[PDB]
From a paper:
Inhibitors of PR target the active site of PR to inhibit the activity of the enzyme, thus preventing cleavage of Gag and Gag-Pol polyproteins and resulting in production of non-infectious virus particles.
The X-ray structures determined to high resolution (in the range of 1.1 to 1.24 Å) by single crystal diffraction from synchrotron radiation show that the ring opening reaction was achieved in the PR/EPX crystals equilibrated with a pH 9.0 reservoir solution. The chemical reaction of ring opening was achieved in PR/EPX crystals by diffusion of ammonia which acts as nucleophile. In situ opening of epoxide ring led to the formation of a new stereospecific inhibitor containing amino-alcohol functions with a geometry defined by the catalytic site. Two different crystal forms, monoclinic and orthorhombic, related by a group/subgroup transformation, were characterized from crystals soaked in ammonia-citrate buffer, both of them showing a complete ring opening reaction, without crystallographic disorder in the catalytic site. Neither of the crystal lattices were disrupted or damaged in the reaction process, and the resolution limits of diffraction data, 1.24 Å for the monoclinic form and 1.12 Å for the orthorhombic, were even improved with respect to the initial data collected with the unreacted PR/EPX crystals (1.45 Å). The P212121 space group of the orthorhombic form is a minimal non-isomorphic supergroup of the P21 space group of the monoclinic structure. Space-group and packing diagrams are particularly useful to find the possible relationship between these two structures which show very similar intermolecular positions and contacts. This analysis confirms the evidence that the two crystal forms have very similar crystal packing, therefore the analogous behavior with respect to the reaction within crystal of these two crystal forms is not surprising.
Residue numbers in the entry:
A (entry chain A), B (entry chain B): 1 to 99
Write the structure that this text describes.
């Protein structure tokens, strides 16, 4: 499937058995999900962009579904303004930016 | 042109007659460029990112070139750590997401 960028590129994802929405973000190195109860081992990390950095929980080898596609990798959990699917997982589902 | 996402999707832009690198950023509504002198009228604006808000100068109807494509539209100038090309201009260059 293919998406223009006339609207925010929101897709449904499944994480820890819960449905959420998230932005497919080519500008994001990493994947950042709002605070939630997520089983798994984690370690503290900072992640940043415009406006500075926030402290997040770094979970490795998390199974997540992104628009129907299964991916497994690192997910950062923290006080992000919006759920973000970054390049670490977009690459695993074979997403590309075309023009 | 099909950009895989193993590395940050950086391209060359031309703005105010100067070449710069910039990131193609499907998660950004707007296009934000680091501090530079640009001639003409602007208005003040605040935009938000992962770490909070920054103040920017909002310039409308700027002529810009992005990876060889012409565009004309709104450019925000302020203390972003990375020059970003948001959806307002990505739609002009015809960028789409594919997976
Ligand atoms: C998510 C982050 C892991 C990501 N940052 C990065 O991927 C790398 O961040 C840095 C920070 C400093 C220096 C060098 C690199 C990011 O901010 N990505 C942003 C672009 C960017 C900003 C600053 C530096 C590098 C990229 C955008 O893609 C951003 N995710 C969107 O605006 C999404 C969004 C929409 C609405 C509200 C809040 C967030």
């Amino acid at each position: 499937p293919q998406i223009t960028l006339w609207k925010r590129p929101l897709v449904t994802i499944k994480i820890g058995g819960q449905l959420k929405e998230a932005l497919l973000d080519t500008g994001a190195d990493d994947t950042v999900i709002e605070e939630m109860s997520l089983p798994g081992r984690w370690k503290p990390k900072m992640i940043g962009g415009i406006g500075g950095f926030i402290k997040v929980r770094q979970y490795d080898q998390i199974i997540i579904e992104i628009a129907g596609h299964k991916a497994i990798g690192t997910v950062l959990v923290g006080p992000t303004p919006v759920n973000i699917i970054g390049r670490n997982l977009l690459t695993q589902i074979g997403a590309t930016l075309n023009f």
